[PDB]
């Protein structure tokens, strides 16, 4: 009964708790595990340098997914392995399930002598299977770009397991590449989706070499606080530089501009 009376309201945005959460992601970069299990293998060993991996985690968000394209080489006369040598961050905005990337792929002179190896994205919860939306994303990219081979491009999922960071890497099958581009259902249990659509690759973290990053030229990679500015047919150039953190100042100008008049 309001016969006594009520109270007043105070607003609390949700990114503030996640901003404090993202400030401590560096503690996870020291406990990064990879999956071994009994998953057979498939071919092509993918080596991921630790420096770009730890940098990719600290600029991440514990709930909103971020993604980065993979570009790499293999040693001179040893074509059986695949060394990831650079992660390209492009304008994007993500949710707790999928990531939204533009239709255009990274095009630059530095990556001219490298081949695409797929893409890597963070995941809030560790799933025993590759997400059905990840098949749809990977297969649709292959349908628009023939440079992405089915047996060469992979999907690395950096799942946020408490206090840790476990990495799982998969690759698509002909059954998966098919159904994936047919998929119009953004669901978690879509139809035609079967475990026959993907198979795990072998991934090995190492400190033998060091990778680099590529970020947009006159832009930034994080568009989560400006999704209206995002459009799937946007074009972008790239520069040779390291990306900024998720909650960097240039990623959320509205929080600073709107606070300038009260």
């Amino acid at each position: 009964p309001l016969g006594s009376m009520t109270q007043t309201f105070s607003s609390k945005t949700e990114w503030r708790v996640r901003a404090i959460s993202a400030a401590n992601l560096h503690l996870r970069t020291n406990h990064i595990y990879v999956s071994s299990d009994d998953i057979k293998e498939t071919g092509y060993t993918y080596i991921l340098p630790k420096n770009v991996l730890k940098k990719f985690i600290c600029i991440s968000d514990l709930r909103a997914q971020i993604a980065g394209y993979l570009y790499g080489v293999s040693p001179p006369d040893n074509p059986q392995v695949k060394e990831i040598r650079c992660i390209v961050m492009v304008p994007q905005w993500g949710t707790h399930q999928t990531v939204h990337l533009p239709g255009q792929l990274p095009q630059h002179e530095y990556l001219k002598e490298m081949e695409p190896l797929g893409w890597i994205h963070t995941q809030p919860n560790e799933s025993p299977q590759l997400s059905p939306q990840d098949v749809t994303t990977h297969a649709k990219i292959m349908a628009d770009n023939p440079s992405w081979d089915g047996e060469k491009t992979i999907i690395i999922t950096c799942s946020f397991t408490p206090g840790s960071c476990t990495l799982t890497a998969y690759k698509l099958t002909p059954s998966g590449y098919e159904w994936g581009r047919q998929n119009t259902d953004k669901g978690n249990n879509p139809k035609g989706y079967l475990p026959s659509h993907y198979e795990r690759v072998q991934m090995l973290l190492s400190d033998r070499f060091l990778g680099f990053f590529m970020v947009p030229a006159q832009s930034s990679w994080n568009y989560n606080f400006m999704g209206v500015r995002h459009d799937p047919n946007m074009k972008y150039e790239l520069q040779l530089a390291n990306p900024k953190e998720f909650y960097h100042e240039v990623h959320r100008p509205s929080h600073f501009l709107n606070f300038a008049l009260l």
Partner: protein, 1725 residues
């Protein structure tokens, strides 16, 4: 020391601060009464009658003052009471003064009479002041008063021409704090933050007078700053012995005698106390004390008292009411107005048609300020710092003209402007202090200043000051204003922060130094006269009379608090203090010791922006800040909207400070009267707080955090976020146009690419186009080039080119613009290198070149990053990615030559008793290095290369090749080359005794003077020279017979080819290889160098077979070398030197307790400071004279021969020092005592490491960088200098090992480890010094075409490194025609530069030919830049004056320092020389040489370093004069050529053409020749004709001095000239005519020319000149050297027919008064 205690400092702290009342009782003057009234109490104190004039107390008029001081008192007629009693002690006395007087008595003029005596000491004759010689410090309490007194002092002394200015306050870069200024007016905190900074390149050395105004501030909480300032300056007098005068001005308060002792004031000389009777205007005091305690009832009661007292003066006297906020001033002014209309009490302020109410309403309209417009017509006004300044002077002007009756202002008016009023009311005495976080009574200074304005000087016969306060504080303000509030000490609260400041400054280094330092503090004097008051019982006072144990406990307590917070490292057993970088940050940035501990705890490289704002909020400067209940709601609205999240809750005060900082950046006006006050205090201190956090993490290499903190400094300074457009930083712009630009989401880096038309279309505002286009390019912007130069597979040198890409505007950018160069790694995580760049407006359009080294690992990283962030501008950054995908690394250096375990070779193998006598008694056998080469050097004739560490006995290996030359040909000639002239003389000293005093083979040392070097060549068998002295001679090899015939050529220390003057060393050896190639019988070449990584490149470049290549490495030194490299974290140079002072002593006792030690220091002044620092450290352990292994008196036949004061005191205890400022008299004596074992330690500077004939067992290299006075930046030690200093740690026949400790900065630690344990890689830099050598090879016709220039380059060491390291020379491939295209552009650009300067001729872009201009530059070894400028300035009417400002601008004189410690000493020498200058400003090295040359011509003896500065100026002046002689004569100019020929003999003998010709004779006085027109003597030949029987008298000399008068007269050249014209009749106009001139020297002379005041010994040069004087046209000229028989011919062609009378000149170049002149006629047909 033993039994100390830890005290509780805050238990001994006077918490009330300035409100602390030490007097327990208060007695008022007679006539004081007090009434009880409406719930309050009033206390009245009557006005004091002036004291009857004392005996001998008359008012002194200004006329009786010293005449030089009356200009500062222009406008005053008679000094008042206190000034006339002080004029003698201030103007005619240097005593420390302390003047006590009530505010308004006129104490400032007494300080002026102190400043006038100081300025009068430094005036000179010209009528000005040598303002480079002194500086005065005026310390005022409030910054508002500082501004006012700068203007008044600047006007009262404007007639002197003296700069008085407030401090810039925001410039550690380009700190023009002073220099231009001479009287600095500052606050106590401002002068202390300056003197806290180390590095005495500051101008505090010139401080002769310090004025401490309102020194009763000692009782205030800011008091400790005055104690720290005085204790620092006074204790500095005890170490410098330079007196500094301290003048204190105080108010009438007790304990003034203790203040006098604290200022070192003699109580019978400088103490002056004038009680309140001496107030010029009598003051009636009324104190109102409120007993009411309700919050707003007391507010109304105060509002009733303020009304009834204004009514007591309404209409009769003006009233000035003081309140303590810029908001209550308007509320109160309206309060005592609304109350009057409530009673119709306003016809009193303004009359019926008043003469003032008309202009009070006509200017209330033009006021345009709404708050003041309401009150102005009624006769009211307000005044505070928030309003405009035109309003304040408007309020001041109307109040000064008796127009406004009531003025309600704050305390700023009392300090800023001298605006007195008859009645002054202080409404309330309570103010909010954000530092204390509560409400506090007003300060004692503010009260005394506001009530000091009561009573106008002349209009009022008395003043009426009214004080309204709470009743419980009446006893305080009664004592403060009636000379009864004692001045106490408030220091113990700030003792830890003040102790650390002296620790960082190096003034205190142990507890004893702090106890002595504490003795100068005002706390100590108060703790002696009233120890009882300061928590010390009178029982314990006499159990410790001077309080030695009490001060020791206070120091021990403060040191433990400082050690716990990691600012100091306290060794409790020794009492020693160790400085830290963290401790230096707190002192230099004025941070309390508790805050930096919080910083050291929470600062992490992975820190967020969220946590960063939290680390700032936890600063202990906000310890008293709380969160009030009335503030929680308004703070809750912002906490839920701040852009940076806050983790803690609103209940904690750390959250509140975070919200106020973010709101201040967003420029949001808050509400709470304490909230906005707390926000101001938080942010006014956030600038220096965040600036400290920036320097902390920047020096730690944290890249991500450095970018965050530096941006927070700029976000706080610019009051904006990064999210906003960087165009709002331009204040000249409306705020709403940029807001429409920002919300239009497009980047700011775009607008650079678009015209001023599309800018208005994007922003949808074509209203103002070019305005934004103007401000876009006014924004700073820099473009970054780079050229990667790989030194090693591990080390990489980087050349960064900075090109400014913006238009400069002094209105926006100022005098300079600052930037930060940041070199980050792959992950943008570690700052591999950071240095500081500063772009000054003077070079705002030039490219800047920066060089640095960064490490590299072999798994070649993807790229590095170079960021250039602006220091002030937000969002102003340029990052250049430095990729390594195309970089070509050099190859791994080959393994060294294995040192064979050979059998030790004795001198038996020489098989020559005459040769064996040179070594058999120095040592029995050779070292393993000298034995391996012996077969190849002594028994072979092949070219040898021996690369061994410094100290491997390589000089003897060079003697092996020399001893072989004398056996195959006893008359053989060898030329030995060494890079340094200091090495050449000691090698000349060593090889003279061995080869000439024992083998009787003549050895010589080249002079650098071409008048004698060619002569020592022919007669000498061993020629010793440096690269420059040999390059000039071997340039003419194909015409000089004695150059191409030498049997041996030895180049020493050839690893210096990569040094500064390495190219010249590369040219000569490459030339010797080419000459031996272009001739029969090759010249043997032996190369000695330090162990090289690419040694076989040098062996290939010098034709050394692999069998003859001996490339050793530092691991085979004959005496083992134990090298230790200690890193030091302190980034401040002067503070880092302090941090390694004690380790210098600790390394001596650890590595060489009994054997000799050499310590290298960066500066000359450091030589003595370290030598003293070592000794007192030796005495601190009570081991005095431990380094004196000789008996105290066996040195006084050596000791008392020197001129220095401290050198003799330090040598007495066994420690000497060497520096360039010392004598040559002094150095050879200290060196002898060092090798004698008498002294164990010597402290030599870095300048003497090449010219030292002493070796030690232990060498300490204290720091590895020095300060360059020209660029005004620190320069790292060259690696070649470090290798030389380590080489001195070598004693073969004395020690089993050699030790060396290198103390360096932590950043340079890994650099020395890679270039001291491994061989040194050397490169060529000839490609940057190509012009001068190409021109020489063109004159000698070695290079006749462009193909020849490419062929000549293949003979160089530069050609072979282009394939081993292509990227070092900006090559991208080592392919065959990659070299040609790179070599061809090098010869194409070098030849075109010479062709532009008119030195060579290019024909069909293939053939080259030298011009006469180039033949002069190559003949006299002069830069082509110098000769080109010589041709444009030498005119037909040039004389001795125009010549000296042509030789001045030579490129060979741009290289010696400009010392602005001296500019006014040169400015007055510009008035000393006989020849004035045109437009002279004295920051150009070419103007200094002109004044220095005239100072030498006039025999003006000057400094000891500027005397030796001319020695290297005159070392090149002869060749510069002869070059002009060859240029003026080539153009057919007669008079300038002969004037230049006379300039040669003028420089040689230091005279003038006007001066007497008898000034050449030795031992003649100055004015000896006023003794000539008295006795008929003019020429030098007269003395030789004056009779010996009477020339014994007259000259008044010493036989000694007339034995040298002959030696000059004998060798004085007089020559009999014979001249004839061949075929006088057969002369056809247009045919040949020859004049034959024969010279017979009349004499028989020995030795060279006698000129003692000239460094180089010269030979007699002569010219024979033909010309027509009336036409000013030289016809013939010819150089010649006259032995005793020489004949000259002068051929020319005849002009038209007629008579044509010519002149026959015979000029000398080293003697004045011998130039003959023969006239003749030539009948032509």
């Amino acid at each position: 020391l033993a039994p100390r205690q830890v005290l509780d400092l805050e238990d001994l702290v006077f918490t009330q601060g300035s409100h602390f009342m030490a007097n327990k009782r208060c007695q008022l003057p007679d006539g004081s009464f007090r009434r009880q009234r409406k719930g309050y109490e009033e206390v009245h104190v009557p006005a004091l009658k002036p004291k009857p004039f004392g005996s001998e107390e008359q008012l002194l008029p200004v006329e009786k003052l010293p005449k030089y001081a009356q200009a500062g008192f222009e406008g005053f007629k008679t000094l008042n009471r206190i000034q006339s009693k002080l004029y003698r002690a201030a103007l005619e006395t240097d005593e420390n003064l302390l003047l006590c007087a009530p505010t308004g008595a006129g104490k400032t003029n007494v300080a002026l009479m102190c400043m006038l005596r100081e300025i009068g000491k430094h005036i000179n004759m010209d009528g000005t002041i040598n303002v480079d010689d002194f500086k005065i410090i005026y310390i005022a309490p409030m910054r508002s008063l500082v501004q006012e007194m700068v203007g008044s002092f600047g006007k009262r002394l404007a007639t002197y021409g003296i700069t008085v200015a407030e401090l810039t306050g925001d410039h550690q870069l380009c700190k023009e704090e002073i220099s231009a200024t001479q009287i600095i007016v500052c606050t106590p905190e401002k002068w202390d933050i300056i003197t806290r900074k180390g590095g005495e390149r500051t101008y505090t050395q010139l401080v002769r007078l310090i004025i401490l105004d309102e020194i009763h501030l000692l009782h205030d909480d800011r008091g400790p700053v005055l104690e720290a300032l005085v204790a620092r300056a006074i204790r500095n007098i005890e170490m410098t012995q330079e007196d500094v005068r301290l003048i204190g001005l105080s108010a009438t308060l007790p304990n003034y005698e203790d203040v006098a002792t604290f200022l070192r004031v003699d109580p019978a000389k400088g103490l002056f106390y004038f009680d309140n009777s001496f107030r010029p205007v009598p003051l009636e005091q009324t104190y109102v004390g409120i007993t009411e305690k309700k919050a707003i009832k007391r507010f109304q009661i105060m509002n009733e008292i303020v009304y009834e007292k204004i009514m007591e003066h309404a209409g009769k006297n003006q009233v000035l009411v003081f309140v303590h906020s810029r908001k209550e001033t308007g509320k109160t002014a309206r309060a005592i107005r609304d109350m009057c209309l409530e009673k119709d009490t306003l016809g009193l302020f303004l009359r019926e048609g008043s003469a003032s109410t008309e202009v009070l309403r006509t200017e209330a309209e033009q006021c345009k300020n709404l708050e003041l417009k309401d009150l102005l017509p009624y006769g009211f006004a307000i005044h505070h710092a928030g309003m405009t300044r035109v309003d304040r002077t408007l309020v001041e002007d109307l109040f000064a003209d008796k127009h406004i009756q009531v003025l309600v202002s704050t305390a700023t008016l009392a300090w800023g402007v001298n605006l007195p009023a008859h009645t002054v009311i202080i409404k309330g005495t309570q103010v909010y202090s954000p530092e204390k976080g509560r409400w506090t009574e007003l300060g004692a200074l503010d009260i005394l200043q506001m009530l000091g304005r009561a009573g106008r000087p002349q209009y009022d016969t008395k003043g009426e000051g009214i004080l309204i306060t709470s009743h419980g504080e009446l006893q305080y303000y009664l004592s403060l204003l009636n000379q009864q509030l004692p001045i106490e000490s408030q220091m113990v609260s700030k003792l830890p922060d003040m102790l650390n400041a002296e620790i960082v400054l190096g003034n205190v280094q142990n507890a004893k130094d702090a106890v002595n330092w504490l003795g100068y503090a005002y706390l100590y004097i108060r703790m002696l006269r009233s120890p009882t008051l300061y928590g010390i019982s009178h029982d314990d006072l006499k159990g410790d009379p001077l309080l030695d144990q009490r001060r020791l406990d206070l120091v021990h307590t403060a040191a433990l608090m400082l050690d716990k917070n990691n600012l100091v490292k306290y060794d409790k057993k020794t009492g020693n203090f160790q400085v830290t970088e963290l401790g230096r940050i707190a002192s230099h940035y004025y941070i309390t010791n508790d805050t930096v501990q919080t910083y050291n705890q929470l600062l992490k490289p992975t820190l967020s922006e969220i946590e960063l704002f939290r680390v700032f909020s936890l600063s202990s400067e906000f310890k008293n800040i709380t969160v009030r209940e009335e503030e929680k709601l308004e703070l809750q609205k912002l906490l839920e909207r701040v852009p940076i999240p806050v983790k803690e809750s609103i209940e904690e005060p750390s959250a509140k400070i975070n919200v106020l900082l973010q709101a201040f950046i967003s420029q949001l006006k808050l509400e709470g009267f304490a909230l906005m006050a707390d926000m101001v205090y938080v942010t006014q201190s956030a600038g220096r707080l965040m600036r400290a956090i920036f320097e902390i993490v920047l020096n730690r290499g944290w890249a991500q955090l450095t970018d965050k903190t530096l941006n927070l400094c700029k976000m706080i300074d610019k009051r904006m976020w990064q999210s906003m457009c960087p165009l709002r930083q331009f204040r000249k712009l409306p705020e709403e146009v940029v807001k429409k630009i920002e919300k239009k989401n497009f980047p700011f880096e775009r607008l650079y690419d678009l015209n001023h038309n599309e800018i208005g279309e994007l922003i949808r505002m074509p209203k103002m186009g070019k305005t934004i286009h103007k401000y876009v390019h006014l924004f700073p912007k820099l473009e970054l080039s780079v050229h990667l130069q790989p030194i090693t597979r591990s080390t990489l040198k980087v050349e960064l080119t900075i090109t400014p890409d913006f238009q400069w505007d002094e209105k926006v950018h100022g005098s300079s613009e600052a930037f930060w160069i940041l070199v980050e790694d792959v992950d943008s995580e570690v700052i591999l290198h950071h240095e500081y760049f500063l772009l000054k407006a003077k070079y705002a359009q030039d490219e800047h070149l920066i060089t640095f080294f960064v490490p590299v690992f072999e798994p070649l990283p993807p790229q590095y990053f170079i960021r250039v962030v602006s220091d002030r501008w937000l969002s102003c950054e340029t990052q250049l990615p430095v990729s390594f995908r195309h970089l070509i690394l050099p190859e791994k250096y080959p393994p060294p030559t294995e040192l064979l375990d050979l059998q030790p070779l004795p001198v038996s193998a020489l098989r020559n008793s005459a040769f064996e006598s040179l070594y058999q008694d120095k040592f029995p056998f050779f070292n393993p290095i000298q034995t391996q080469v012996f077969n190849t050097v002594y028994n072979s004739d092949d070219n040898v290369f021996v690369g061994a560490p410094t100290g491997s006995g390589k000089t003897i290996c060079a003697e092996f090749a020399i001893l072989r030359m004398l056996l195959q040909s006893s008359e053989g000639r060898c030329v030995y080359i060494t890079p340094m002239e200091a090495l050449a003389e000691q090698v000349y000293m060593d090889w003279y005794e061995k080869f000439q005093d024992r083998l009787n083979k003549k050895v010589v040392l080249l002079t650098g003077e071409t008048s004698t070097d060619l002569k020592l060549l022919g007669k000498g068998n061993i020629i010793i020279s440096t690269p420059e002295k040999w390059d000039i001679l071997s340039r003419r090899w194909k015409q000089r017979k004695n150059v191409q015939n030498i049997n041996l050529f030895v180049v020493d220390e050839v690893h210096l080819i990569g040094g500064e003057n390495g190219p010249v060393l590369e040219v000569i050896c490459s030339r010797m290889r080419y000459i031996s190639s272009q001739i029969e019988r090759p010249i043997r070449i032996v190369a000695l160098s330090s162990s090289l990584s690419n040694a076989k490149d040098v062996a290939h470049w010098l034709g050394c077979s692999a069998t003859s290549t001996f490339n050793f490495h530092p691991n085979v030194r004959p005496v083992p070398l134990e090298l230790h490299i200690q890193g030091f974290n302190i980034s401040h140079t002067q503070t880092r030197l302090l941090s390694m002072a004690k380790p210098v002593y600790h390394a001596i006792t650890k590595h060489s307790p009994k054997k000799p030690v050499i310590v290298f220091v960066p500066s000359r002044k450091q030589t003595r400071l370290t030598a003293i620092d070592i000794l007192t450290t030796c005495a601190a352990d009570i081991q005095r004279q431990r380094f004196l292994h000789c008996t105290e008196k066996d040195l006084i036949p050596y000791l008392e021969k020197l001129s220095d004061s401290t050198l003799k005191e330090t040598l007495l205890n066994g420690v000497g020092y060497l520096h360039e400022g010392l004598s040559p008299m002094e150095r050879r004596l200290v060196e002898q005592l060092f090798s004698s074992g008498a002294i164990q330690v010597v402290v030599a500077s870095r300048s003497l490491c090449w010219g030292m004939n002493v070796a030690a067992h232990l060498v300490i290299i204290m720091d590895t960088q020095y300060y360059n006075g020209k660029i005004h930046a620190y320069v790292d030690y060259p690696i070649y200098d470090v290798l030389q200093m380590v080489g001195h740690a070598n004693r073969p026949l004395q020690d089993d090992e050699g030790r060396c400790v290198i103390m360096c900065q932590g950043s340079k630690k890994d650099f020395f480890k890679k270039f001291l344990y491994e061989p040194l890689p050397v490169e060529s830099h000839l490609d940057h010094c190509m012009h001068d050598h190409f021109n020489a090879e063109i004159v000698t016709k070695t290079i006749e075409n462009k193909q020849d220039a490419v062929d000549y380059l293949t003979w160089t060491f530069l050609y072979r490194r282009m394939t081993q390291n292509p990227n070092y020379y900006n090559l991208q491939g080592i392919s065959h025609r990659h070299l040609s295209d790179h070599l061809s552009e090098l010869v194409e650009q070098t030849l075109s530069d010479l062709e532009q300067s008119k030195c060579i001729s290019i024909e069909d872009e293939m053939d080259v030919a030298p011009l006469n201009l180039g033949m002069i530059a190559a003949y006299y070894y002069i830069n082509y830049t110098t000769i080109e400028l010589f041709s444009m300035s030498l005119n037909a009417k040039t004389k001795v004056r125009g010549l000296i400002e042509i030789i001045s601008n030579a490129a060979e004189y741009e290289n010696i320092p400009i010392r602005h410690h001296e500019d006014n000493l040169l400015r007055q020498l510009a008035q000393k020389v006989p020849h004035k200058l045109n437009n002279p400003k004295f920051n150009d090295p070419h103007v200094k040489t002109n004044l220095l040359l005239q100072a030498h011509l006039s025999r003006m003896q000057l400094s000891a370093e500027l005397q030796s500065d001319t020695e290297e100026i005159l070392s090149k002046a002869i060749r510069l004069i002869q070059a002009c002689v060859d240029v003026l004569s080539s153009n057919g100019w007669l008079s300038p050529a002969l004037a230049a020929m006379e300039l040669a003999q003028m420089v040689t003998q230091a005279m003038w053409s006007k001066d007497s010709y008898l000034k050449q004779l030795p031992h003649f006085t100055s004015e000896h020749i006023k003794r000539c027109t008295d006795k008929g003597v003019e020429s030098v030949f007269d003395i030789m004709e004056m009779e010996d029987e009477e020339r014994n008298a007259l000259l008044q000399l010493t036989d000694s001095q007339i034995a040298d008068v002959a030696r000059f007269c004998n060798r004085y050249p007089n020559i009999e000239l014979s001249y004839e014209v061949v075929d006088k009749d057969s002369i056809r106009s247009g045919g040949p005519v020859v004049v034959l001139v024969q010279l017979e020297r009349e004499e028989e002379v020995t030795g060279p020319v006698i000129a003692p005041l000239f460094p180089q010994k010269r030979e007699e040069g002569w010219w024979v000149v033909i010309g027509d004087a009336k036409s000013n046209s030289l016809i013939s000229i010819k150089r010649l050297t006259l032995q005793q028989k020489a004949k000259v011919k002068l051929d020319f062609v005849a002009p038209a027919t007629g008579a044509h009378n010519y002149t026959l000149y015979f000029m000398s170049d080293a003697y004045m008064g011998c130039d003959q002149e023969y006239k003749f006629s030539v009948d032509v047909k």
